[PDB]
């Protein structure tokens, strides 16, 4: 693997001598829990949800309130 | 933003990180020059009251200096006519838990500024380690709006400085060491309303690509690679965060920046090129869509986070063609220079000839020729790899002399030993998976662990280095250059240095309180020219000194590499301002006195 | 110690707190004088890496500067030829619990030095907040011996600086706010062996009195008062700790110092004169026995801890008699001046005419005439008392010009409201029992809480004040004067000032990083004269700023009094060294570079 | 009470109008626990005891040892 030969444009990865082309089911399988892998995405659409409320309220009232709990 | 562009043309202003949209860090002021530098002395100082690394540089707008600090990220405003009086101060209250998820010390690269239209006043924009982005009233310091950008519960923090373009604020992101999938966001400077948010990995929809993305360089890759170059959902925690600097060209309306290293550090768990981290991006300021993207380090296995500084310029190529360029000294040891209009490679030379991770960078395939002998992988111990994860160039913001067509860069001379290891991913916990050991490069003293840095003058078209000089420690925080034929910069061992732009001769230096990891800035006030710089060692190189670590492999290996740092400096936190002969506000001892 | 006496005669030395045994803080160096002061600029700086108040001043001996810091009390040694390199450093490991029993911020007044005989090397003596006293090898920094002087489990800590006399070290004591019975100890500088220890209250046996104690002034009181002036065992927790400064006269072989306030602050619980706190003592250096003792504030009810500086001199009294004197600006607002050979009162004038707690001090009875209208007591609220518990003069170490026969003192202009309250005594817990409220004095701005200090030139025999000047904040850390007709001093709002010795005109000032609560010191190195001073606000006045307190009655009332302090300064910690034109070690930028 | 009249040399304290000459058994009695009042004294003669050992050992061996436990 020296990065010179490419399956396709922008894709030139090759496994190193002695390593699988797919680590799935191999000795090197991460075995990632999708439960975990999705935490970040939820984190964002909650933050976006709160910010949405904060911003809208600000537009409405002209007064900014950070605590979503106090927004009506 | 045209007021900003206008304002930046003023010598008694410094309205944004990097001084201007070209981010050349160049001043036309020649009051302080190689003829009188030896008279440069401290005019006044200001302690920020905090320890830990002090990166970035202050802002000077409308007779006031705005100072930012490390966590908990306070903000101060000083009147240039009487600096001893703090006009207003903002002291955020943040969850102390944010401290635990910060890879590399509690730093912050700086503040941004928005002129104001009419209805809304001038604003100071800041980011907080805990993920909040706030807009403060530039004159009173009260909060206009505050929103959540990053959530620490998932490992995402903020250290990058905001960037104001037109009427929007651009916020980066940090956390790849904890498997955080990168994304930059644009907010409405006026309301805090989210305009667009683009990610560095995953579905093209999340990538926000223009319909003509890389149309001029189809070989860079185009659609589907955000997931195509990964195995399974791995991209969901693929990293690629952008915590460095930006550059902007009103002509192309493009925002230029680079994305970070993929996660984890364990190369073996990320089979594939890991598009799109480690890539130079060209995004439309208003829409957010990417018009070109060149990946510097396909399938990273050294942690060459490609977030380093972007510096624009206009020069003639070897064919005599005038080109609108962008020069990029990357962590991988290669200085990239692309056409900032279509993303074409113009040159990619090594920062130092000791770089051995790549034989070279093929300009017509755009791929870097890998030397297998220095790659990393499971069950193996790679040795004497250069550059180390700290790279031959890090977070420092360099400068460019438009007249000399020279870039003055603060280089790192550190190599490493490397061996990964398996580990699970738990949102909120580190996801590095690699144990390092770093030391001085070939040209340094590997015995006494000194000679970790260097500073060079470089031409992007020729690839020639007008001059090179060795520094005791890595030159971490960037450089600044003036028409006075000087190049200033701070050092980790606690100096502010000045070199002759042409010869690189050290003409002057001063012993500041603590090491410097930010860049110098200069401005004029009432006719006098000043040079300011923060003091307070920290950041990744100062980790061992800051958290009192002894194990050489601690601090992700950085500890061992800077074991001698504590014999030249200790922590600190503040600003030192220099002027010819120390001339300043208090030359008349009665100003500021109590009457 | 005759080498010390000899060494102190050298201008490129500063071998003890107060410069010499007379503790006049006066330098014969006239290189920097009122003619060229306006050229004084920073030559180099050094951050100590710690926040909190930085009191005292560094020591300069044999080409090296020794720097001490606040808790955990680190020690650094710098080579004057290359200050950027730390020769050695001592970083003590202390029980963090010591922090809880420190009344007034984690400060430390300084280091002491012992020349060495032959068998034993030169030593640096230091005290630690946790009660230990250590002797370090002046050249290597390794510990020669370390012993326990104060036990924090009982509330006793250490902040005072050691004092070397002949071949012994004198260690004070701190803790009266936690009912600690005061005692000073003399150790064998060579082995750490305890030679003598005298207490401030109790049986004459514990007081260690000479058989001829106060024989010349029997009215001061003599035997039996250590218990006689108390009710029951109250004296056992009577206070009287000595944490200020000392003075020494080889001629009389007497150690001069003052004892502190009695405990608790609650006047009503201590019926009686409370001998022997608040008293000026004359003790024999070798034996420890007291040859004279004059109590300044019988039965204290304001907390006028009588530990302030002792400055010796020789002048003619109003009868034309040459007298060996000692001048003492006390917390109670009276400047005492006694014959240092028998303890006779020579003069006792008010620091400021706004002092109202005493009508006057009867020189022939030695008693201060109390104005009942301003005393304190249970079930009552005393108002507009001057001076406040902080006194009109605190821990600052002033100076004396032998030629002008003038004492330049850093004064406090703060009064208070006061009302005590009952409370039990539990070893280890505070035992104050009084709630205060302080503010600016009559001559200050009580509205905006500014004008809390002043600096005056005073003659002990005439009682005349050559000149007086108002300062924004209390002038807390003392002054230093040179033959250059200058008087230097640091201010809480973060300046180093210089005034004309004769007129008191402000000739020059510089903006240092943080407020200054220590005194300036000066020395010559390779022909150049330098002036150094610590920066880092703290101590009692900075309590609110340091521990982030808002309640005006917090920090034993100090908080409210300095509410405006945070608009002029923030915490810091380091040293700034000034020289004419900023001349210094690095004038040749290559010194200290890596080759 | 103005401090001018003294029972004896060095002793001039007088109670203020309305206060006892002895607070013992009065409304203002501290009621101090002698158990507490003696803690400080013990604290010292223990410290002096340890230091004694440390110093003596140093004299003997020429090597200083702070940990009394390791001294023999
Ligand atoms: O992957 C990441 O998101 C991330 C973030 C940061 C940061 O936020 O400061 C650094 C790094 N990586 C990194 O690899 C590293 O080199 C580094 C050095 C420093 C510094 O402040 O000196 N920050 C960071
Ligand atoms: O009774 C005591 O033992 C004691 C100790 C100290 C100290 O150790 O610093 C102070 C005081 N009292 C005190 O009353 C006070 O004025 C004070 C101010 C300061 C300062 O460092 O600024 N220390 C102390
Ligand atoms: Ca990283
Ligand atoms: Ca006290």
From Swiss-Prot, chains A, D:
Region of interest (Disordered), ranges: 23-53
Disulfide topology: 6-12
Gene Ontology cellular component terms for the protein in this record: periplasmic space
Principal place of residence: periplasm
Any GO MF annotation of the entry: alcohol dehydrogenase (NAD+) activity
Enzyme class, broadest EC rank: oxidoreductase
Recorded catalytic activity of this chain's protein: 2 Fe(III)-[cytochrome cL] + a primary alcohol = 2 Fe(II)-[cytochrome cL] + an aldehyde + 2 H(+)
Listed GO biological process terms: methanol oxidation
Basic and acidic residues composition bias: residue spans: 28-39
Location relative to the cell: Periplasm
Enzyme Commission code: 1.1.2.7
Annotated keywords: Disulfide bond, Methanol utilization, Oxidoreductase, Periplasm, Signal
Keyword Iron in record: no
Subunit structure, interactors included: Heterotetramer composed of 2 alpha and 2 beta subunits.
Entry's family note: Belongs to the methanol dehydrogenase subunit 2 family.
Purpose of the protein: Catalyzes the oxidation of primary alcohols including methanol.
Name of the protein this chain belongs to: Methanol dehydrogenase [cytochrome c] subunit 2
Organism: Methylorubrum extorquens (strain ATCC 14718 / DSM 1338 / JCM 2805 / NCIMB 9133 / AM1)
Curated annotation (Swiss-Prot), chains B, C:
Cofactor(s) recorded in Swiss-Prot or TrEMBL: pyrroloquinoline quinone; Ca(2+)
Cofactor note: Binds 1 PQQ group per subunit. PQQ is inserted between disulfide Cys-130-Cys-131 and the indole ring of Trp-243. Binds 1 Ca(2+) ion per subunit.
InterPro entries per record: PQQ_b-propeller_rpt, PQQ_MeOH/EtOH_DH, PQQ_rpt_dom, Quinoprotein_ADH-like_sf, Quinoprotein_DH_CS
Top-rank lineage group of the source organism: Bacteria
Any GO molecular function: alcohol dehydrogenase (cytochrome c(L)) activity
Keyword entries, A-Z: Calcium, Cell inner membrane, Cell membrane, Disulfide bond, Membrane, Metal-binding, Methanol utilization, Oxidoreductase, PQQ, Signal
UniProt-listed Enzyme Commission number(s): 1.1.2.7
Enzyme class of the recorded protein, top EC level: oxidoreductase
Record: residues binding Ca(2+): 177, 261
Record GO biological process: methanol metabolic process
Gene Ontology cellular component annotations, sorted alphabetically: outer membrane-bounded periplasmic space; plasma membrane
CDD domains referenced in this protein's UniProt entry, alphabetically: PQQ_MDH (cd10278)
A UniProt-annotated Pfam family: PQQ
Active site per UniProt: 303 (proton acceptor)
Catalytic activity: 2 Fe(III)-[cytochrome cL] + a primary alcohol = 2 Fe(II)-[cytochrome cL] + an aldehyde + 2 H(+)
Function: Catalyzes the oxidation of primary alcohols including methanol.
NCBIfam families in the record: PQQ_enz_alc_DH (TIGR03075)
Similarity annotation: Belongs to the bacterial PQQ dehydrogenase family.
Name assigned to this protein: Methanol dehydrogenase [cytochrome c] subunit 1
Organism: Methylorubrum extorquens (strain ATCC 14718 / DSM 1338 / JCM 2805 / NCIMB 9133 / AM1)
Gene this protein is translated from: moxF
């Amino acid at each position: 693997y020296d990065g010179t030969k490419c399956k396709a444009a922008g894709n030139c990865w090759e496994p190193k001598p002695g390593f699988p082309e797919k680590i799935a089911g191999s000795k090197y399988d991460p075995k990632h829990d999708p439960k975990e892998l999705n935490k970040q995405a939820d984190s964002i659409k909650q933050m976006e949800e709160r910010n949405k409320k904060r911003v809208e309220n600000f537009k409405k009232t002209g007064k900014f309130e950070y605590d979503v709990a106090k927004i009506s | 933003n045209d007021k900003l562009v206008e304002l930046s043309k003023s010598d008694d202003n410094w309205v944004m990180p990097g001084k201007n949209y070209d981010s050349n860090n160049f001043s036309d002021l020649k009051q302080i020059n190689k003829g009188n530098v030896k008279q440069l002395r401290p005019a006044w100082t200001f302690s920020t009251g905090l320890l830990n690394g002090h990166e970035g540089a202050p802002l000077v707008v409308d007779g006031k200096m705005y100072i930012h600090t490390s966590f908990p990220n306070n903000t101060f405003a000083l009147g240039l006519d009487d600096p001893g009086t703090i006009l207003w101060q903002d002291k955020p209250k943040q969850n102390p838990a944010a401290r635990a998820v910060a890879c590399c010390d509690l730093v912050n690269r700086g503040l941004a500024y928005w002129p104001g239209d009419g209805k809304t006043p001038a604003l100071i924009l800041k980011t907080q380690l805990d993920g909040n982005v706030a807009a403060l009233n530039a004159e009173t310091g009260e909060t206009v709006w505050k929103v959540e950008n990053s959530d620490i519960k998932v490992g995402s923090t903020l250290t990058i400085a905001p960037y104001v373009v037109k009427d929007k604020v651009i916020i980066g992101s940090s956390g790849a060491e904890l498997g955080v999938r990168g994304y930059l966001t644009a907010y409405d400077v006026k309301t805090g309303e989210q305009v667009w948010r683009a990610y560095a990995t995953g579905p093209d929809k999340d990538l926000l690509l223009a319909s003509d993305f890389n149309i001029k360089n189809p070989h860079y890759g185009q659609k589907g690679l955000g997931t195509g170059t990964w195995e399974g959902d791995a991209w969901k925690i693929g990293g690629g965060t952008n915590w460095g600097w930006y550059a902007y060209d009103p002509g192309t309306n493009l925002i230029y920046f680079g994305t970070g290293n993929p996660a984890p550090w364990n190369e073996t768990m990320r089979p594939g090129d890991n598009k799109w981290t480690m890539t130079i991006f060209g995004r439309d300021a208003d829409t957010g869509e990417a018009k070109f993207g060149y990946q510097k380090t396909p399938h990273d296995e050294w942690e060459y986070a490609g977030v380093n500084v972007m510096m624009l310029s206009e020069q003639k190529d070897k064919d005599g063609k005038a080109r609108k360029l962008l020069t990029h000294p990357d962590r991988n040891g290669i200085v990239y220079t692309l056409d900032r209009t279509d993303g074409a490679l113009v040159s990619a030379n090594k920062l130092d000839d000791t770089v051995n991770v790549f034989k070279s960078v093929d300009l017509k395939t755009g791929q870097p020729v890998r030397d297998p002998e220095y790659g990393t992988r499971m069950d193996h111990l790679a040795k004497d790899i250069c550059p180390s994860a700290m790279g031959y160039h890090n977070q420092g913001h360099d400068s460019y002399d438009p007249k000399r067509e020279l870039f003055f860069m603060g280089i790192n001379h550190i190599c490493m030993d490397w061996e990964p290891f398996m580990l699970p991913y738990r949102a909120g916990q580190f996801f590095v998976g690699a144990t390092l050991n770093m030391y001085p490069g070939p040209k340094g003293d590997r015995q006494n662990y000194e000679g970790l840095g260097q500073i060079k003058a470089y031409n992007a078209i020729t690839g020639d280095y007008k001059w090179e000089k060795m520094e005791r420690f890595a030159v971490w925080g960037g450089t600044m250059a003036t028409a006075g034929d000087l190049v200033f910069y701070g050092t980790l061992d606690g100096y502010l240095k000045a070199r002759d732009s042409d010869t690189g001769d050290l003409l002057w230096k001063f012993k500041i309180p603590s090491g410097a990891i930010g860049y110098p800035m200069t401005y004029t006030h009432k006719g006098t020219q000043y040079v300011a710089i923060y003091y307070g060692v920290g950041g990744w190189p100062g980790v061992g000194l800051v958290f009192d670590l002894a194990d050489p492999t601690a601090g992700l290996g950085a500890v061992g590499a800077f074991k001698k740092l504590a014999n030249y400096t200790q922590m600190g936190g503040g600003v030192v301002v220099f002027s010819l002969d120390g001339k300043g506000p208090y030359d008349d001892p009665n100003v500021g006195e109590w009457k």
